Design a protein around this motif. Structure first.
Motif, mmCIF file in Angstrom:
data_model
loop_
_atom_site.group_PDB
_atom_site.id
_atom_site.type_symbol
_atom_site.label_atom_id
_atom_site.label_comp_id
_atom_site.label_asym_id
_atom_site.label_seq_id
_atom_site.Cartn_x
_atom_site.Cartn_y
_atom_site.Cartn_z
ATOM 1 N N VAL A 1 -7.994 -25.847 28.892
ATOM 2 C CA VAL A 1 -8.792 -26.778 28.101
ATOM 3 C C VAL A 1 -9.423 -27.870 28.946
ATOM 4 O O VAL A 1 -10.189 -28.685 28.410
ATOM 5 C CB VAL A 1 -7.975 -27.398 26.951
ATOM 6 N N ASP A 2 -9.129 -27.923 30.244
ATOM 7 C CA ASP A 2 -9.677 -28.953 31.119
ATOM 8 C C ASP A 2 -10.548 -28.390 32.231
ATOM 9 O O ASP A 2 -11.696 -28.821 32.389
ATOM 10 C CB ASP A 2 -8.539 -29.792 31.724
ATOM 11 N N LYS A 3 -10.038 -27.432 33.007
ATOM 12 C CA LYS A 3 -10.719 -26.981 34.213
ATOM 13 C C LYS A 3 -11.591 -25.749 34.012
ATOM 14 O O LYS A 3 -12.442 -25.473 34.863
ATOM 15 C CB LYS A 3 -9.693 -26.689 35.317
ATOM 16 N N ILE A 4 -11.406 -25.004 32.920
ATOM 17 C CA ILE A 4 -12.184 -23.785 32.727
ATOM 18 C C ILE A 4 -13.621 -24.086 32.317
ATOM 19 O O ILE A 4 -14.511 -23.259 32.551
ATOM 20 C CB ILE A 4 -11.505 -22.870 31.693
ATOM 21 N N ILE A 5 -13.877 -25.252 31.719
ATOM 22 C CA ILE A 5 -15.236 -25.593 31.309
ATOM 23 C C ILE A 5 -16.149 -25.707 32.522
ATOM 24 O O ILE A 5 -17.294 -25.238 32.505
ATOM 25 C CB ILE A 5 -15.235 -26.888 30.476
ATOM 26 N N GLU A 6 -15.662 -26.340 33.594
ATOM 27 C CA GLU A 6 -16.465 -26.476 34.805
ATOM 28 C C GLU A 6 -16.779 -25.116 35.417
ATOM 29 O O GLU A 6 -17.905 -24.876 35.871
ATOM 30 C CB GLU A 6 -15.741 -27.368 35.814
ATOM 31 N N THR A 7 -15.799 -24.215 35.441
ATOM 32 C CA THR A 7 -15.996 -22.857 35.949
ATOM 33 C C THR A 7 -16.412 -21.976 34.778
ATOM 34 O O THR A 7 -15.591 -21.308 34.150
ATOM 35 C CB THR A 7 -14.731 -22.338 36.621
ATOM 36 N N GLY A 8 -17.716 -21.961 34.494
ATOM 37 C CA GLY A 8 -18.230 -21.282 33.317
ATOM 38 C C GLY A 8 -18.143 -19.770 33.362
ATOM 39 O O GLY A 8 -18.431 -19.126 32.348
#
Length: 48
Positions: free
Chosen positions: A18-25
């Protein structure tokens, strides 16, 4: 005792997906874990 959620437990809840996966699309659309976390969040917070 009507406790619902804890801050540290919410950090443990899902956690990185929920935090770091958004940046790595490249993984949010792959639905390995982002889709499940999004569906769980929608289920748990939409009533509230």
């Amino acid at each position: 005792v009507s406790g619902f959620a804890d801050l540290d437990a919410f950090q443990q809840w899902f956690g990185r997906p929920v935090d770091k996966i958004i940046e790595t699309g490249q993984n949010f659309g792959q639905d390995k874990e982002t889709k499940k976390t999004v569906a769980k969040l929608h289920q748990v917070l939409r009533p509230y």
